[PDB]
Design a protein around this ligand. Structure first.
Ligand SMILES: O=C(c1ccccc1)c1cccc(C2=C[C@@](O)(C(=O)O)C[C@@H](O)[C@@H]2O)c1
Ligand SMILES: O=C(c1ccccc1)c1cccc(C2=C[C@@](O)(C(=O)O)C[C@@H](O)[C@@H]2O)c1
Ligand SMILES: O=C(c1ccccc1)c1cccc(C2=C[C@@](O)(C(=O)O)C[C@@H](O)[C@@H]2O)c1
Ligand SMILES: O=C(c1ccccc1)c1cccc(C2=C[C@@](O)(C(=O)O)C[C@@H](O)[C@@H]2O)c1
Ligand SMILES: O=C(c1ccccc1)c1cccc(C2=C[C@@](O)(C(=O)O)C[C@@H](O)[C@@H]2O)c1
Ligand SMILES: O=C(c1ccccc1)c1cccc(C2=C[C@@](O)(C(=O)O)C[C@@H](O)[C@@H]2O)c1
Ligand SMILES: O=C(c1ccccc1)c1cccc(C2=C[C@@](O)(C(=O)O)C[C@@H](O)[C@@H]2O)c1
Ligand SMILES: O=C(c1ccccc1)c1cccc(C2=C[C@@](O)(C(=O)O)C[C@@H](O)[C@@H]2O)c1
Ligand SMILES: O=C(c1ccccc1)c1cccc(C2=C[C@@](O)(C(=O)O)C[C@@H](O)[C@@H]2O)c1
Ligand SMILES: O=C(c1ccccc1)c1cccc(C2=C[C@@](O)(C(=O)O)C[C@@H](O)[C@@H]2O)c1
Ligand SMILES: O=C(c1ccccc1)c1cccc(C2=C[C@@](O)(C(=O)O)C[C@@H](O)[C@@H]2O)c1
Ligand SMILES: O=C(c1ccccc1)c1cccc(C2=C[C@@](O)(C(=O)O)C[C@@H](O)[C@@H]2O)c1
Lengths: 141, 141, 141, 141, 141, 141, 141, 141, 141, 141, 141, 141
């Protein structure tokens, strides 16, 4: 049983340079945390990241064809992309929206999300652990 | 530590209506799962519901005093009450807002929350499990 | 059959202050008028008023359980309470929204109603007689 | 002892189409149903329908001129016409706005009425019986 | 079968603007062009124009009753009339909204339309040919 | 040297109600005052009234054709009719929006005009005399 | 009987750049024009211009003290100054708002006036002749 | 000469957290401070607080029945409660709304008050003293 | 201690007009009443009024150099001036906003103030005693 | 000769998911279909699809360079890309905006398009035939 | 060639408070620097500052008669004055808008400018040197 | 010092069309100009362009890692991309925003920037030379 964890724009740079606001864990450390929780829960996590929206669409397309669940942090594209939402509307397995930071306590534009109205649910502001809590939801389907 | 699980108005009527949106689990059955799960997490859950504001604020006053964390599902009051936001403002230990349903997939009015801005984080649309996923978060702050 | 007539905040003060707007009948005389009209229609009208939200939710709960009709005039809460709206969402029998003043003739905030969209119907500004017309609609289903 | 009942655009076609919205009754069937109830109340009821605004304003002037109460379902014009409002603001006797369907639970544009702030009162969503209920209000004024 | 082409207020005046917007063909030319083209697709086109909404409702009501397709250019009514839309909604064959100008390059008020949501489709900005294309669409039912 | 004075809906009933806002002059009196004034300015006025949009459409269409100027008091169609604006937009000769009451000092809805932006100029709040002040402007031009 | 005619900021510089929009007439010429015209109406116009809001309010104070009428073209202040509105609100004789150009067919912001709800009437888009028309209104009271 | 000092939700906890924005003073210190000034000014001060909208409404009812004036700091309910407002509207002696914090310097939502438009006057951001400054006002009616 | 009392545009007219709104006290009498109270509270009050924004700024700059407190009634400029706002933001000593009238019971636009979010606090609607209440607060810093 | 057909995000997966909207033809089959119709019109269609914004931009550049007309269905990019619109504005030959679904009959955000204001025309909701009607318009203009 | 540098309100207090974004130079030294660079650029720069709106518009008038160009930091009046905006619209020579601080990273109300839409361009956030870079643009014409 | 000059989508087409809202110069020439100018300043300019959001993010990433400043003209992305802004918030050297045309004199949507709130400063409407003024500022640090 495969779960896709896809991260969009700028999340390769986690831990790097600044914040504070996202944690000091790096993308590589997070990939490794996700795989460890995955195994504990008896699932295979496939974790990916890109700064390219097209690449992101391809990734969601394969999840849709594979009937596979998706934990998604679209990053910036969350509040901006209809193309990405239109792709997610094709998933028939669950979709969990994830935000590292509590997006409801920041700039007002971070409060809109094309993803929320079609996701199974959303997790916001629980640190990197949010990913791990999502996985565990998926583990109970 | 102790953790207070506070349920807002109507939530006493759980799983008698619209099993599709709010679950088939009754309120008692919920007290059950949360308590057990908190035991497994090595915490002690105190799980209470009320149809009344004063009551709610009072319970939140106590958690403040005790410097204990709160999982809050405030029901309809999530969307209307500054009194409750202000009581939750006192808390020095983490606050986690929960909603069984995906509020972003429903009436527009349900997408404004007074708590999201001052909560540590927010779990929406993952059903009943959302309470337990809040617990696991708290188990390591 | 039983027909609940539920009056929300301040409506107990019915009679003192500003007739013209909400007419010269006291609350006690209103109860009398209602039960009378109901009797001549074939119904038993239980008539109740409360300044307390929790109280009003409880009575809706009871009506919901019992599957009886409800005629509601929530006063202030019409414009502000989501908790109350949801409690009425439980009801499987008709729910008539009633206001004595024409709320469309007055301040802007009185023109918004959280109950209107889930009501079977709405009667506004036809004085205390607005209640009696609701009874009559119910007598014929 | 005369009451006027005026239906606007499209109400010629009382279904014809649809169900829980609008009648299963026809316009003729309504005219006669009104006159029955009217007669029963000791009132001559004058029921008229037009798809012409111009023609509706003219009926309204005559009611204005004779100081007779008016029951008005302006259909689409409710939400749109200032001219129809201006004509009605001339009525010295009572004006009751009736909508068959519950307009507050439909598209957003239906939730506005140029008539409501100047009507005596407003009945919404009680079906065809809403005309009859407006008749006995006037029976008492 | 038969196609109804319906033209609203001011469309009689086609040919007194010149220039961009509406073009130099006139309404008589238009009926001839539409009639030739249609019988060349093997349909018969009944093309009608009126400055009066009540007249336009009537002709819709007819199509509703006879179950014919309507190609509609509502002129200024497009932006203002709940009445027209409600009439159009009754139609059971295709309904195609047509605008000669690009209503999207013009005044903001012209950007809005009560017809679009309930139509099969909308052709805009393609000049006169727009009518002819909508016929061709109708040629494949 | 013809001037067209066109009076939209409800203006046929001037005189009786609200003489402190529209004057206590009837329409028949307004006709005489205008004619007598255009006479003395050496113009000929044609003063027409109608409650029908289609009828007004026609009268505007006619001045468009005769290149004759229009003083228009569209009454309630001022705030609602694009069809009306679009017909006036065809005039080559001057067009003057007239309003007897100070619309800016009244309901919010009365403050928007579809005519002002395409008009030569606009007179508001100067009573019946605003009609005659518009004649004087056109005489000087 | 003295009429006051106050011109706000930039109007000192009429004549140079435009018309249409503003005059080809200079402020000096306009003073003479008004003066000649008032004289053959039986009025003495006093005509003043100033870029200083202080200066302008002092003049409005003078006419409030003398109970004299005021024709006002306030320039940019028309859309911005509460201080100018409030000075004018003290006036017991009429106040006519005059704009040379049609403020309704230019930038959105020019369509809003702090002065209009408190004027007797407004005259817009009749060029300089707007001044003389206003005096004529005053001649009749 | 009795003056009622009524405090709303959470205000019982004054002085224990964020002492920089609300009192450094406790609720008891505040009752002491007020009765001292009440006495000093020749009044009686009755100071009650509550977390319950219903209890508060009850007290406004009492003052209203006794034509005693009210100083209200409704806290959270200031922004949310139409109920509370409607009860206050009933008072015949002065209503002075008080806030300890400067509500105009904080979250946007704190800048709406249902009480303000019905109050005699409002004191804000002057600390605990504001109550005492309100008393002196009442001592002069 | 010097306390500066600054009154803005149109304040030179207090007590000739709207005596229910702003009171029957003249500005001279207001000066003498403020000064008097100043002595009672052991301070000097320098009270000045100007219709001129520049003059008002120059005064506020001076209070800032001198590091003296300000009780400001800016009249009109309260809702419109960023210049004034920016001058008051330089005050190192307290700043109290005073309005005579209750600005929240009046026009919509009298609810906005550039001052309030930078004032120490605000007193509204308490009539002339409002300046004196501000004085007393200042007598404790 | 050369007409360009460009399809945006996700339209590679055409025919596959919601046939009732979108249709049952795959992309490959659309290409064939459009090349066929173009040949009968004496045209040559080049039909291209791509999830990448920059790729789509590159293609628009090429037709601008080549003065070729463009028929563009951008999917999600329709409502979000200024970049795409700006590319399209460079074009000198006609631009035709096509949407297979009626975009006015779904979520609100699908009702805004950055392309419509700069397009020659727009066809929406006429299924896959929209591409073909767009071709024929181009063959005639 | 001559160049006009015009500082509006509060700008005579440069260098007092604070650091950013104003930041450190007094207006005296500011004048000295500008004239320096200007000479180096081989220009003649006249640097004037005023708190008076009226005074400001005077200088703008002079510059327009001279056909000199203008660097303008209007301070508060950028956000509020249509008068200032209208006087700048007669400059035949270029008009550069300068802000010392970044208006976009500050309060919402600082983000609107009556000036921007009619300026040649706009320099923001680059501190005191922004004046300096604006000279350079003018240097190159 | 290295300074990165980053151009967004379509800027490759610079100077080829709509000269000069943007173009006289081409993109190649601009690189020439930026470089010569930079060298004369003792700076090294690296100038780069892309129509790809991801490709622009990547170059922003390289500037953050190298603590080099960025001059950015983001094209259409300026108004729409949160990914780009979030990437620019990592930067530790100055970020200057540059637009060739006056964005505030054009379509309403171009008056919005995700980049401005976080940029050191913004230069708009000074044509190509704005890049050169941004170089000069940086040379000052
Ligand atoms: O803004 C940065 C940044 C981080 C470190 C240093 C400098 C800037 C950044 C990077 C990646 C993702 C995200 C983002 C991540 C989120 O999706 C999240 O909270 O998980 C919220 C979303 O709105 C935002 O674009 C932000
Ligand atoms: O509206 C009902 C209802 C219940 C049973 C049958 C029919 C309606 C209801 C009841 C309790 C809580 C809640 C609510 C619970 C939520 O907090 C949630 O999804 O957990 C979302 C919140 O918006 C809502 O008031 C809703
Ligand atoms: O506001 C008063 C009041 C009483 C006495 C004197 C002055 C005002 C009051 C009291 C009870 C119910 C209600 C109300 C009742 C209504 O539901 C109604 O019309 O029945 C309309 C609703 O908007 C309002 O809150 C108002
Ligand atoms: O939509 C139709 C229709 C129904 C069957 C056949 C053809 C059209 C229709 C007709 C008359 C009135 C009305 C309408 C009537 C209402 O005034 C009403 O509820 O009575 C609400 C109002 O918003 C709507 O325009 C609708
Ligand atoms: O404004 C005129 C006019 C006519 C003849 C000469 C000069 C102007 C006019 C006439 C008919 C329809 C229309 C109109 C036609 C449209 O339906 C259309 O684009 O076909 C769009 C709509 O917004 C407008 O009312 C305009
Ligand atoms: O609303 C009435 C009415 C008349 C008498 C008694 C009661 C109401 C009415 C009648 C004719 C024209 C008008 C109107 C007249 C105006 O055009 C005008 O002031 O001339 C302003 C316009 O907004 C309104 O439709 C109103
Ligand atoms: O903006 C200019 C200008 C003049 C010549 C060349 C370029 C600009 C200007 C000057 C005087 C008065 C006025 C003004 C005068 C008006 O009051 C008017 O139309 O009378 C309308 C009002 O919105 C505007 O501020 C504008
Ligand atoms: O939010 C708190 C709090 C207390 C302690 C620690 C942290 C927050 C709180 C408590 C009582 C009243 C109030 C409030 C009281 C106010 O009425 C006031 O300033 O007096 C303004 C109003 O907007 C707010 O709800 C706030
Ligand atoms: O409009 C007059 C007036 C004066 C004397 C007689 C009649 C009217 C006026 C004068 C000074 C201040 C103010 C004003 C005073 C306020 O500052 C206030 O309520 O004190 C509110 C503010 O919005 C308004 O501009 C009004
Ligand atoms: O949203 C989906 C989807 C389809 C089936 C199943 C799940 C999602 C999707 C896919 C491709 C294009 C398009 C779209 C295509 C349209 O351009 C169109 O109607 O052609 C309208 C436009 O707003 C939308 O983005 C949507
Ligand atoms: O607000 C002050 C101040 C000075 C000291 C202490 C506190 C505030 C101030 C002074 C001069 C100009 C300016 C201003 C000038 C600006 O144009 C600018 O950035 O140059 C931005 C503009 O919005 C603001 O009004 C502000
Ligand atoms: O629209 C075109 C175009 C290109 C070539 C020929 C004709 C038009 C275009 C191209 C590049 C950048 C830009 C743009 C450039 C700006 O960033 C700018 O002025 O620097 C303003 C911004 O809003 C717009 O996206 C526009």
């Amino acid at each position: 049983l495969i779960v896709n964890v896809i991260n969009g724009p700028n999340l390769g740079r986690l831990g790097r340079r600044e914040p504070a606001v996202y944690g000091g864990t790096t993308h590589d450390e997070l990939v490794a945390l996700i795989e460890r929780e995955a195994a504990e829960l008896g699932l295979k996590a496939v974790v990916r990241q890109s700064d390219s929206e097209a690449q992101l669409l391809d990734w969601i397309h394969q999840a849709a064809d594979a009937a596979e669940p998706v934990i998604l942090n679209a990053g910036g594209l969350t509040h901006t992309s209809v193309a990405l939402r239109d792709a997610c509307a094709e998933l028939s397995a669950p979709l969990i929206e994830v935000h590292i930071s509590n997006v409801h306590a920041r700039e007002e534009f971070r409060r809109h999300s094309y993803l929320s109205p079609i996701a199974t649910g959303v997790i916001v502001g629980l640190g990197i652990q949010g990913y791990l809590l999502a996985l565990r939801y998926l583990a109970e389907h």
